[PDB]
C-alpha cells in the first residue's frame, strides 16, 4: 500500500511582495533564485502553482512552515495541500 502523495501549492495574492515569495521558495523548497523566480511568476500569472510533491507529513510540514513564515513577516501568502 504505497503512501498517498501530496502536492504543495502556492496561491497568488495581490499584496505579498514577489521578492518575498522568491525567498520562501529558496528557503523552504531548495529552489535556486532562477527557478524560484520563474515559479513565483507561474503563481503570479496563473493564480496558483505546484511548488513540490511530497509524502503527506513532509508536505504538511512545508505548508505549515511557509504559512507561519508568511504571517510572521506580515504577508497574506497562502500555501495549501492538495492530494496528488
Amino acid at each position: 500500500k504505497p503512501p498517498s502523495m501530496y502536492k504543495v501549492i502556492l496561491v497568488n495574492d495581490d499584496y505579498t511582495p514577489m521578492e518575498f515569495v522568491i525567498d520562501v521558495l529558496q528557503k523552504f523548497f531548495s529552489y535556486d533564485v532562477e527557478r524560484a523566480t520563474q515559479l513565483m511568476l507561474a503563481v503570479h500569472y496563473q493564480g496558483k502553482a505546484i511548488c513540490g510533491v511530497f509524502t503527506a507529513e513532509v508536505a504538511e510540514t512545508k505548508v505549515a512552515m511557509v504559512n507561519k513564515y508568511a504571517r510572521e513577516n506580515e504577508h497574506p501568502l497562502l500555501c495549501t495541500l492538495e492530494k496528488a
Binding site: Y15, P17, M18, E19, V21, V33, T37, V43, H44
Partner: peptide, 10 residues
Amino acid sequence: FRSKGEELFT
C-alpha cells in the same frame, strides 16, 4: 503578487 519595482532576472 506585488512587484516593488525590482527586476526579476526571470
